[PDB]
């Protein structure tokens, strides 16, 4: 069956070039277009270009005629795109996208089978694990709030549990936010019962892949 | 072409009938028009091609129309795994343009939010920086509006916030706002304090504490 | 070029981190800072063989 399979999340530094590939199994890869699409954090999607392998003509966007490049390697049914000059505005999720094939009579002209994105992040920012600091509950009728603030680390993504994923209930992970430093930045909280903050222990589990950080922060309540 | 969407929002109950719309500046064939439901984190899912042909395995309930430059997508009973956000397509070889999205919400009743107030630790002035979070807890509708004051004096550009996806058991948004300031600056005033408007509030809720006590 | 590694054993902070440098000397001052961002203050050991810095606060 139709898979579509990416390259991994890469850091450019801006005014570099990636190239990202997209591995195809289980259909042919010939006759049916590849396009790359993608999506910058909280937008939409925008077609970048395609290619019909067989005939490997390509096709961009007007928006990226000239730094971007799309061929395919029918020796190994993978697509590529090569973005150059990058720019913080070319921070996006990249899809390869591929058409789907009719009954009998053919192109469905619509993607049918999608990538599972590759996250590029374009930034000068080196790899920094994150900084992890209580959000102390305070002595919200008989609720108490309580979280983790998980600070200045680069790249995306970290994520965190409570507890090693034994408190569930009431856990709000927000989406981080980037500052001016080029550091990420976010928040976690758990809402729990002002009665447990005497016998219950508040663990954040902090992960984040790129810094091999696991840190495990102990929130406790300020007297 | 410009494939436009309306509306941004759509906020319905399950059980309801969502009719989204996309219209075209110019005239757009009907086996070139799709559409695709997009949930958080996830890749874009075709749901439509050719205007009004189901792709495999979308259930029956989804059903598109249209020609020229009006098409629609009518979801005729929303089932909870229906909310999320959906984009109409004009496919081409050489060019191919997205609507800007339509997100479908779901609506419930009016929610207040609960406003919490975190000063910052110290184990972070120990490095010379200071964060305040302003945290709003399980409110709807999504629009808030967050107000840092420092000595009663309005901030302004030194605050970020961000907001949760909807949450699938009580439909609720909720918000953390961080207000940042060097060490020195938060050393030189005593009252911060979170200003929360919103719908189910009859007046502004304000949270606050005093750095030290 | 060479991984070296951060072992932190605060009251409250516990867990591990790394970092990639030439030297020993310049891992421990990317890790000695990360340590007081998070303000942990203990008391520093070096592992040459398995290139490990540890911090570890008096009691836990």
């Known amino acids: 069956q139709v898979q579509l399979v990416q390259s991994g999340a890469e850091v450019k530094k801006p005014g570099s070039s990636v190239k990202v590939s997209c591995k195809a199994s289980?259909?042919?890869?010939?006759?049916?277009?590849i396009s790359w699409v993608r999506q910058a954090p909280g937008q939409g999607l925008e077609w970048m270009g395609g290619?019909?392998?067989?005939?490997?003509?390509?096709n961009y966007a007007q928006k990226f005629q000239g730094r971007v490049t799309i061929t395919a390697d029918k020796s190994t049914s993978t697509a590529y795109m090569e973005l150059s000059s990058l720019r913080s505005e070319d921070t996006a999720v990249y899809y390869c996208?591929?058409?789907?094939?009719?009954?009998?009579?053919?192109?469905?002209?619509?993607?049918?089978?999608w990538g599972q994105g590759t996250v590029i992040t374009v930034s000068s920012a080196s790899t920094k694990g994150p900084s992890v600091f209580p959000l102390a509950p305070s002595s919200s009728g008989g609720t108490a709030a309580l979280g983790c603030l998980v600070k200045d680390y680069f790249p995306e993504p970290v994520t965190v549990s409570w507890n090693s994923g034994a408190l569930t209930s009431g856990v709000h992970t927000f989406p981080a936010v980037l500052q001016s430093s080029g550091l990420y930045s976010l928040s976690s909280v758990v809402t729990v019962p002002s009665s447990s903050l005497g016998t219950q222990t508040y663990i954040c589990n902090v992960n984040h892949k790129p810094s091999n950080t696991k840190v495990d922060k102990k929130v406790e309540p300020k007297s | 072409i410009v494939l436009t969407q309306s509306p941004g929002t759509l906020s319905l109950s399950p059980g309801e009938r969502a009719t989204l719309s996309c219209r075209a500046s110019?005239?757009?064939?009907?086996?070139?028009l799709a559409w695709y439901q997009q949930k958080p984190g996830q890749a874009p899912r075709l749901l439509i091609y050719?205007?009004?042909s189901r792709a495999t395995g979308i259930p029956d309930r989804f059903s598109g129309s249209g020609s020229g430059t009006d098409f629609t997508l009518t979801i005729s009973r929303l089932e909870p795994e229906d909310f999320a956000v959906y984009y109409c397509?004009?496919?081409?070889?050489?060019?191919?343009?997205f609507g800007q999205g339509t997100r479908l919400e779901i609506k419930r009743t009016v929610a207040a939010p609960s406003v919490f107030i975190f000063p910052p630790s110290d184990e972070q002035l120990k490095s010379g920086t200071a964060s305040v979070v302003c945290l709003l807890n399980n409110f709807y509708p999504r629009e808030a509006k967050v107000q840092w004051k420092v000595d009663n004096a309005l901030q302004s550009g030194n605050s970020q916030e961000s907001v949760t996806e909807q949450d699938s058991k009580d439909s609720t948004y909720s918000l953390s706002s961080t207000l940042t300031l060097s060490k020195a600056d938060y050393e030189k005033h005593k009252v911060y304090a979170c200003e929360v408007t919103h719908q189910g509030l009859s007046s502004p809720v304000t949270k606050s504490f005093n750095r030290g006590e | 070029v060479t991984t070296y590694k951060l072992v932190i054993n605060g009251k409250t902070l516990k867990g591990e981190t790394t970092t990639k440098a030439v030297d020993a000397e310049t891992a421990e001052k990317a890790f000695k800072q990360y340590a007081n961002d998070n303000g942990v203050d203990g008391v520093w050991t070096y592992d040459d063989a398995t290139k490990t810095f540890t911090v570890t606060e008096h009691h836990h």
């Open positions: 996208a591929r058409e789907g094939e009719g009954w009998f009579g053919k192109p469905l002209r619509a993607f049918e089978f």
């Open positions: 289980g259909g042919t890869f010939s006759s049916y277009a």
């Open positions: 290619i019909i392998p067989i005939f490997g003509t390509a």
């Open positions: 110019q005239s757009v064939s009907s086996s070139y």
């Open positions: 050719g205007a009004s």
């Open positions: 397509q004009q496919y081409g070889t050489s060019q191919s343009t």
